[PDB]
Amino acid sequence: SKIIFRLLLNVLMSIIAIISYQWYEQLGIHLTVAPFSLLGIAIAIFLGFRNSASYSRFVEARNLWGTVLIAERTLVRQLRNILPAEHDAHRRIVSYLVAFSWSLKHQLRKTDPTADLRRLLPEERVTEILASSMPTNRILLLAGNEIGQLREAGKLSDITYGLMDNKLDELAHVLGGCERLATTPVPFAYTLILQRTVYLFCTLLPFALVGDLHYMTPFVSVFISYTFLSWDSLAEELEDPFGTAANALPLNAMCNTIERNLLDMTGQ
Amino acid sequence: IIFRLLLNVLMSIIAIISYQWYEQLGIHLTVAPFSLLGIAIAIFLGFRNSASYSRFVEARNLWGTVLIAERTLVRQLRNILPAEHDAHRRIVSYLVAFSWSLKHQLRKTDPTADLRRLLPEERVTEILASSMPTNRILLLAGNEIGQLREAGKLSDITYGLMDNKLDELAHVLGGCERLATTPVPFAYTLILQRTVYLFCTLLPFALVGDLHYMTPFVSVFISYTFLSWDSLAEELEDPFGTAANALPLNAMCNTIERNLLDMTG
Amino acid sequence: IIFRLLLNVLMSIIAIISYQWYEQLGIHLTVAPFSLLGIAIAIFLGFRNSASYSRFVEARNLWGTVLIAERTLVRQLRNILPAEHDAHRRIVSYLVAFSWSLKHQLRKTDPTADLRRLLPEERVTEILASSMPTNRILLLAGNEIGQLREAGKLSDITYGLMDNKLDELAHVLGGCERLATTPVPFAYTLILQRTVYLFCTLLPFALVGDLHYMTPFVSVFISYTFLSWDSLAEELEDPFGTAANALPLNAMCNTIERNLLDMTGQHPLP
Amino acid sequence: SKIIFRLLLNVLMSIIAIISYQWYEQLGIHLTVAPFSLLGIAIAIFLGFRNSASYSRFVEARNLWGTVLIAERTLVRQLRNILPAEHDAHRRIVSYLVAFSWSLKHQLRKTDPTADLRRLLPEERVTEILASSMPTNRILLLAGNEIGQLREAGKLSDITYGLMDNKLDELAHVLGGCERLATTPVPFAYTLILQRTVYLFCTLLPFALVGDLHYMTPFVSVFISYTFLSWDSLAEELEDPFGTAANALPLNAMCNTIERNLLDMTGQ
Amino acid sequence: KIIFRLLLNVLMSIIAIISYQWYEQLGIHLTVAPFSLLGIAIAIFLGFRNSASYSRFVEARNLWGTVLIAERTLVRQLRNILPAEHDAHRRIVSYLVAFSWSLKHQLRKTDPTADLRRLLPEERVTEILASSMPTNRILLLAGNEIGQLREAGKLSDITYGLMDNKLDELAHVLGGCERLATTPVPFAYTLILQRTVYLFCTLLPFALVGDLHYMTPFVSVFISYTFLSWDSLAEELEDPFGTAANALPLNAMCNTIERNLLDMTG
Ligand SMILES: [Zn+2]
Ligand SMILES: [Zn+2]
Ligand SMILES: [Zn+2]
Ligand SMILES: [Zn+2]
Ligand SMILES: [Zn+2]
Ligand SMILES: [Zn+2]
Ligand SMILES: [Zn+2]
Ligand SMILES: [Zn+2]
Ligand SMILES: [Zn+2]
């Protein structure tokens, strides 16, 4: 990664620090570790408070997608527990439930849900989902019609309707939550203040080290840079929880984890 | 944007051109007390920086709940009362006015323009004549829900479902007004911001013996770190304000209007 | 409060004048042990300040819920029973009296005058004849909701909607009583106040070795930083007091009163 | 208490450090303070993260006993608004709610609740309570029958039963929480490491302080030891809030405030 | 203290003594200032890691505590609404106990076959085990048992709705217990911190032999053992559903759950 390919830049700066210092006493400039000890601790504190604030954003993103699996489990569970014979209406409500997660992933992955929506639904309902400015929310609205048309039919009482209605709210905070994380990210004034302070601290660190470390400088400076640049790279992976990176959320595999449950909850 | 930190560069350079009075007026300023003082300050600045971010998160979570609540509320009307679009455009218009009137209550601005756009003048005067306009709007939306209670159009259960989502909006109002009135006492932030700069200006006075001519480079680089982690924390304690890293409340109310209006049909 | 640092400059002034003799018993004082000691204090002073702030937030969070619960409860009355405006003015007074007695319960004041202002004396005398007066108000307001259920005006469902709004008010009482009756760091705060005062006074004795006569200039600045972070750290753990304390419940207790009265129509123009 | 001994033992090691200071400079060992700042700060960092772990557990312990206070209030209040005349059932559910608080306090103090059960309940029901595994859970089950025997007879609707039922679950989440705070203690595999890292640092610090401060080490070493030894000893009572510590929860007084409240809602 | 690598920290300390004197050449020197700053920088990051992992341990305990509480209240509501239908009692309890055990086997990745055959008929064990997420098949079967009491007219939908809210408390745990064991913090950080902690502990004695020649092995381990310990706790708290009996005793909680529901009948 860019961390590792720029961890090399301080090694030459350390040897540059070694090969310099010969005109230092003429100019009259000296660089010790005491100001960088103060500065380094101040940076490591701010990097730590920035990392734990980022970790919660990773946890909050993780909890919202975990609730989807919980809500749809119980919703299909309640449909097979209150209306066990309406297995014709089971697979319709399920199909909307499957479309929401995929449309959620494609809405958070900024891709095209057209291909995945036609797989589960007749084309009539796919464009109806695509006709609104928020297709996922149209699915929640569409899921209500399959639940709502059963209310006036006398199959579910108004309480049994409200109890299943209370399971779309758990689903509704997820869409409203995942949409909220990607539009209000951690204020960029944060990562830029740390990467501007970490990189500039890492480059000027060997200039403070060879006055006390002499030739052992490149070994120590890189080990301190590696610690900061790795601790900083953690903040860069927590900011993309819905992306395609090598170490992100496997949302394609998580939509798969949700689909195999509901389909085994009805038929196969 | 900066606190003219260049003045510490002059304060660092002043120590250099004064350093000629080093042993004559008998001054020693070492790094250990300023390291102790500086580490203690960066420790105290770290706990405040995360604390302001938390106030920022609570405001965004409340505004996200607003988008979710009105999302679900307009949805519940479309599943139980599929034909009652005469009451939709009234309940929706009240819900949209709630968001705009809330933002103007937190910005201490005038909500007159946005209310006349969505509601009739006769009821706009009804809203503006009260000491709590948002709760009066939420109260007005309840009348449109209450007039739907009637006797048999919505069951006794079904009213409670919409009542259980108007209170979700009310816990937002009680919080957002609480965040805009419950901050750190404006005498404890003041003692903290003035302590950082006093460490910031006297830091080069102690760094000359160590960093002779390299003093302004480190003094500014430590100034930049301390003055930034403190000045950004001053942007997050008022997420309803006009700061850079503030909540762009204009665009969230705009996103809610485009949501409900796309739900009308 | 302020002269503690003037005592600290004097400790430096004494430290300056009591160090030319600093050889009686062979003794030297360095800054490194006080850096470790000071950094450990800044770690512990930082963790103690965060605990006080949290109880301050819960005091605002619980008192913020007071505004919401009484709003939602009174608003619920104007959407289901808009014509029974006679029962509005009774529940409101209880909700207004609940907040006032809630403020009066935690400040250890006499709620008689504000209860005589808002309630008839028969309910004032019975409430003041109880030790837990606030819990009686929600119970008295609960009968107002129960009598509307027993008469046929509120269904078994709709009663439960308003009962869940008196419970939000009931969870407020038990929490505000919990923060004000068990401020747990009881008597153990002086782990820092006795250490900071002792650290700040012995600091110039360790600083006058490096900073000779310039010691008070730094000595007050490090003492000012620790003792100000300390006086702030114990101002927030009592979010119901006077002086600089940032909770002014009277303006919040009045605002809930003026809100429900403005939600019921108490400013008519003839 | 057991930190004044370590402080008295820490003063004695400093006097040994002075009278041995002349012995170990020939032995061929030298001791500076610089590792002890890193080690002490590393310990001072760990004492801060552990104190936050104990303090959070104490607040949760206090909140559960506040929740018992609130839930039984609402349950007694909900009973006085739906069945206000059923005072034959008032003193029965109140006694169950009161016995619940006491039996829980005896369950966390690991004593025998028989004595307070004969005071509040009929003796035959004391035999029934003691014949179960969890005595507290048997009490709330008894409170449910008094609500349950009122529903099937026609006095409580299916809805109004749930309104009071939703307040016994609030009491049940307390029992499992109070059970979790006790049955699942904070991970104490480090408390012994904190006994071993702090005292060995506190005792060996004056051996490193006698290098710079000659006679002033016992004055300084205690000020560093007392500050270190205080922050750890405070963490030892806050992680055990159901015991008989000086900061512990005075559970005796909480049951009294709960009983005197519920008794004040029943005409006394 | 099972760290055999803490003894490995001692060996370079004597090497540091025999080398400090043998290789001052070419200017390379190791002083204490960079490793003190670096050590504090690590101790800051190790503290933020333990509390983040510690919360993962706490969240794991609450999920199993909610399982204990949820099954309690569900049984409480049934003996207060249907005290006479004890023929149906012996069925639901077995599912909740089978759910409790099957959840522990799902997080421990062990075999629940015997645990289900003790409680359920072979035909229903074949139905549960011949499917994905057997715990959810148990809760779905437990839901079927509640639906038949509404369809029987024995439970109103209101009292049914009172009980339905308790299958979600168990389902939010299952979906929650699935979350803690499947997506922890990325491993690419576990090793870079294990490579940063162990490499810092081994390179410390080369930096300690300044004026600390003979006292080096005593301090290096006391700092390394202290560092190697505070990191090792975060490695047990990050996997609270793992093999470590000192992490979570699911056997002691699943049995404690069994002892309660079985104690309402004997
Ligand atoms: Zn089916
Ligand atoms: Zn419409
Ligand atoms: Zn509310
Ligand atoms: Zn009215
Ligand atoms: Zn409650
Ligand atoms: Zn009574
Ligand atoms: Zn529960
Ligand atoms: Zn039975
Ligand atoms: Zn749920």
Numbering used by the authors:
A (entry chain D), D (entry chain A): 22 to 289
B (entry chain C): 24 to 288
C (entry chain E): 24 to 293
E (entry chain B): 23 to 288
Sentences from the paper on this structure:
Although the structure of hBest1 is still unsolved, two Best1 homolog structures, one from bacteria Klebsiella pneumoniae (KpBest) and the other from chicken (cBest1), have been previously reported. Overall, the channel is a pentameric assembly with a single ion-conducting pathway, which varies in diameter along its length and is constrained at two narrow points: a “neck” contributed by three residues (I62/I66/F70 in KpBest and I76/F80/F84 in hBest1/cBest1) on a transmembrane helix, and an “aperture” formed by a single residue (I180 in KpBest1, I205 in hBest1, and V205 in cBest1) on a cytosolic helix. Here, by electrophysiological and structural analyses, we show that the neck and aperture in hBest1 are both indispensable Ca2+-dependent gates, and their dysregulated opening by rationally designed or patient-derived mutations causes Ca2+-independent leak and elevates Ca2+-dependent channel activity.
Alanine substitution mutants for each of the 12 residues were generated in KpBest and hBest1 and subjected to crystallography and patch clamp, respectively. Moreover, the equivalent KpBest mutants (W16A, G18A, S19A, L259A, P262A, G264A, and D269A) all showed an overall similar structure to that of WT KpBest. The corresponding “Ca2+-binding” sites in WT KpBest are occupied by Zn2+, an essential component in the crystallization buffer. Interestingly, the KpBest P262A, G264A, and D269A mutants show no Zn2+ in the corresponding sites.
